[PDB]
Design a protein around this ligand. Structure first.
Ligand SMILES: C[C@@H](C(=O)O)c1ccc(C2CCCCC2)c2ccccc12
Ligand SMILES: [Ca+2]
Ligand SMILES: [Cl-]
Ligand SMILES: [Cl-]
Ligand SMILES: [Cl-]
Lengths: 359, 361
């Protein structure tokens, strides 16, 4: 196995495959004019392909990922990196820098189980990035309810939807993708979501998604990501979407956020409860804590409905406003004992639901 | 106690005094005093004190209280640019009002707030902010971390002639920097604790306000603008850097600092994770750096340098060398060598104002 490649042509692929003992190594393969790099943690895998325009010899090995990446990154901008397999070591040479790395046999590199694709679609990268970024923050982290430690991907009509919840607050994002889809639902593990998100480079390469019974694969440009799905049932989240909020309030996103952020300083550190008093074109926010410190914020908003009061977790609401990053927000309300739904006033694509608190 | 002050006039002082504050609650509070047309804000941890004076041009009423430092800072910082902030003590609560934002904070009595002991200044001088910045950043990285010789965890500040000098060492490597300050000083040495050095750096805003330093037998104080920092000193017998500098390191190697740094940083990848040893082979106009680890992975770097005279080999902890090269921020470095079992001296090839000494492995 031999190849010589420019540093930068190696670094982006290296970043991608480092994501997921031999699991600490990258599989390197030279075949039919291409260097492929693979990383895996047994749950998911990333493969990156690099065209080889310089002379090369086929073969495969595995090397320590961190060390190989660090060596490549540490070399000067635009350096040519020459790699050859010599016995049980992989030799890396560039200028008068030389390295000998330990290898493990390519034959030992684990493969993900084989599977059949049953649902497929192609969409712009930007659309998938919007879908994930809109909801990722609301996934559970390491809940014993393992089916929450990930993100629902739901197809219906011509729409792809992501849903995330930690068992307390909810994020939903829905986008038309211009193809007729079967009504289908899968849960992608949270680490897979993160790795998928970070494979999307913000460019013009379209993303191809293939979903099997127990696996998902995403292909964009020179990168192929594959993951197991979470084998579980996602909660019936539709039950907490307010059926008909009769009251709708519109406010400047940043003004509302800064008022909540200031009030939060004097909210209970653990339960983070703040109260909203809604009246004709006015919102008053209050907070207090066990040391009897108190905050009050009054802002002008657009609101005509009946006066009402409602409490909620200000951390959850701040998370929502930070995700929305827009000009104006719409808060849809019912009463003091019902949830609140929050959206960008200019777009219904993303929606967030926060539960009510009594004080 | 009442005042109204513009947000921007409050924010820097609040940041200056509150930054390093947090099991004794009142230590988490700032002391606020309105007296003689000035708002004074004070923070302390009992070892050091930060005091800022703010002229009150708007109507105000005298008095003092203490309030949670972080909360008051966060409230002020969270208000919009240009906000006017009105404060008044009402009973045992401190009220803060700006626009239609209102806050009521808990207080502790100003009478309970702790004072650093009184002391007398013995040594005084003034110097540019830029010089203090240079003195600290040139040596700070070489201070010990949690060493049982507590004085090594701080920084020596020495006056000699008209130079102010800092020295830092952890027993394995040493940094020294000396700068002229144009005033006849007595020969004097003090040790400033770690936290003190951090605040002494933090208080330099990068303007042209000069620093006024007062040193007593047990304290140091720095005045810049309307901020006053005071720290207790540390007792102990700091090493004499004069005795740590190699007596005659007449093997002189010159190399590009960034080239040298990058070569060591790559070799370090395949050095021992705990011990971090690399070997240097010096020969005519050439340096070779090698590293290997228990797994027998190997790095080799060869560099062109300026070196004439005898060949030698020497081993170093590569972290120590990298720390020096990252602190130098210059074009060319000079390494002054003696033999395989003696320390190396390292300097900017174009300035003798700082020197670095590293023991070999
Ligand atoms: C009815 C039940 C279910 O389908 O099993 C259910 C429904 C809805 C949710 C969340 C709660 C709050 C924010 C988003 C919806 C659940 C969360 C954890 C466990 C069960 C949940
Ligand atoms: Ca000196
Ligand atoms: Cl606001
Ligand atoms: Cl109030
Ligand atoms: Cl080698």
């Amino acid at each position: 196995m031999k190849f010589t490649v420019e540093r930068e042509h190696l670094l982006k692929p290296l970043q991608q495959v480092s994501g997921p003992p031999i699991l600490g190594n990258l599989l390197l393969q030279v075949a039919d004019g291409t260097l492929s790099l693979t990383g895996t943690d047994l749950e998911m895998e990333m493969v990156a392909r690099v065209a080889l325009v310089q002379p090369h010899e086929p073969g495969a090995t595995t090397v320590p990922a961190r060390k190989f990446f660090d060596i490549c990154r540490g070399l000067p901008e635009g350096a040519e990196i020459a790699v050859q397999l010599e016995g049980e070591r992989m030799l890396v040479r560039s200028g008068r820098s030389r390295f000998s790395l330990s290898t493990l046999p390519a034959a030992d590199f684990p493969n993900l189980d084989d599977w059949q694709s049953e649902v497929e679609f192609t969409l712009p990268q930007a659309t998938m990035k919007r879908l994930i970024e809109a909801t990722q923050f609301s996934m559970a982290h390491q809940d014993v309810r393992y089916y929450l430690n990930g993100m629902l991907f739901e197809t219906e009509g011509e729409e792809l939807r992501t849903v995330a919840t930690d068992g307390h607050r909810l994020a939903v994002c829905s986008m038309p993708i211009g193809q007729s889809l079967p009504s289908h639902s899968v849960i992608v593990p949270r680490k897979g979501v993160i790795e998928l998100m970070r494979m999307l480079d913000g460019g013009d390469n379209p993303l191809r998604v293939q979903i099997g019974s127990n696996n998902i694969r995403a292909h964009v440009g020179d990168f192929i990501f594959t993951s197991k799905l979470v084998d579980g049932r996602f909660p019936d989240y539709r039950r907490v979407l307010p059926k008909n909020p009769d009251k709708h309030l519109e406010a400047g996103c940043d003004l509302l956020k800064q008022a909540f952020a200031r009030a939060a300083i004097l909210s209970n550190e653990k339960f983070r409860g703040v109260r909203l008093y809604v009246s004709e074109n006015q919102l008053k926010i209050t907070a207090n804590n066990p040391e009897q410190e108190e905050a009050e914020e009054i802002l002008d908003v657009t609101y005509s409905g009946a006066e009402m009061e409602i409490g909620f977790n200000v951390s959850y609401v701040l998370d929502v406003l930070n995700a929305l990053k827009c000009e104006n927000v719409r808060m849809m309300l019912t009463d003091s004992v019902s949830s609140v739904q929050i959206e960008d006033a200019a777009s219904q694509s993303a929606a967030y639901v926060v539960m009510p608190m009594r004080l």
